[PDB]
Amino acid sequence: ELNSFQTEEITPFGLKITPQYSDQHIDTLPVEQLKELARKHHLLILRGFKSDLSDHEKYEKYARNWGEIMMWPFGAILDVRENSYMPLHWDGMYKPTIPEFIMFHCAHAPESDQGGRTTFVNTRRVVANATQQQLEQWKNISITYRIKVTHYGGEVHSPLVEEHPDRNGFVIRYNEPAVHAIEYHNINPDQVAEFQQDFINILYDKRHLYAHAWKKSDLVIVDNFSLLHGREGFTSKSERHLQRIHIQSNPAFNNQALR
Ligand SMILES: [C-]#[N+][C@@H](Cc1ccc(O)cc1)C(=O)O
Ligand SMILES: [Mn+2]
């Protein structure tokens, strides 16, 4: 009745999953149990397992065990390759569907790289830590985002607070500004600047944010319905190479914010 992997809880949220014996293969892990843990804990770091997922064919075949892949024009896999931070967002903003899971495989992460950790914000925890007056204000705010050339048109109008697709709580949908692109609704224009200051401070809080330093062959599973994610600005030059696959909910979740 024991698990077939070791688990350690991450601060402030998430699970770090590691092998029980040397050279344990990633294919040994029970995918349906992992999906349940990812929905409950929002972030899984699978570290130390043997895999050949830098092979695009093998990675795609592996991800199909998790569900329907959300395909992009370039295919199933985005190869993320290498100063400013990348703003918090959720994936699928400008697409017709929002994927439930992001899978990141680390094909390359030199110790040579300094900083630039991937950021993960548990918006369920943000909602749970808010006062009632805060949450009431946030539920009344909606935001229009304008982006780059995209395949499906490029304007997003999203409430700041949404109910989770599983109807078991509320989440935050927010795209932080980068250093009009963003336009806030239902708030006095006189208060927008300070609200933006205050809300970004709330998201970049040690109670809510986990910053991940990559190691080669990490497989990270992200609950895109519950989290926002981004990246710290890089101090040094980096050769990091991540490989990203999106997995649809069943049925796929249509993106009502796309305009
Ligand atoms: C569609 N879409 C994107 C969403 C996005 C929006 C803003 C930003 O800075 C980065 C990514 C994805 O899911 O990849
Ligand atoms: Mn992203």
Author numbering: 3 to 84, 95 to 159, 161 to 192, 201 to 280
Text from the published report:
The ternary complex (PlsnB•Mn•4) was prepared for structure determination by co-crystallization approach. The diffraction data were collected to a resolution of 1.98 Å, with each asymmetric unit containing one molecule of PIsnB in the space group P212121. The final model shows that PIsnB exists as a monomer which is consistent with the oligomeric state determined by gel filtration. Analogous to other Fe/2OG enzymes, PlsnB has two four-stranded β-sheet in the center, a.k.a., jelly roll or Swiss roll fold. The metal ion is coordinated by His101, Asp103, His250, and three water molecules. The benzene ring of 4 locates in a hydrophobic pocket formed by Tyr106, Ile159, Trp102, and Met105. While the ample space of the hydrophobic pocket allows the rotation of the benzene ring, the π-π stacking of the phenyl ring of 4 and His101 may result in a preferred orientation as the observed in the crystal structure. Namely, the carboxylate is anchored by Arg265, which has a cation-π interaction with Trp74 with a distance of 3.5 Å to the indole ring. Since the carboxylate group has hydrogen bonds with Gly104 and an iron-coordinated water, such orientation enforces the isonitrile moiety to point away from the iron center. No apparent interaction can be identified within 5 Å of the isonitrile group.
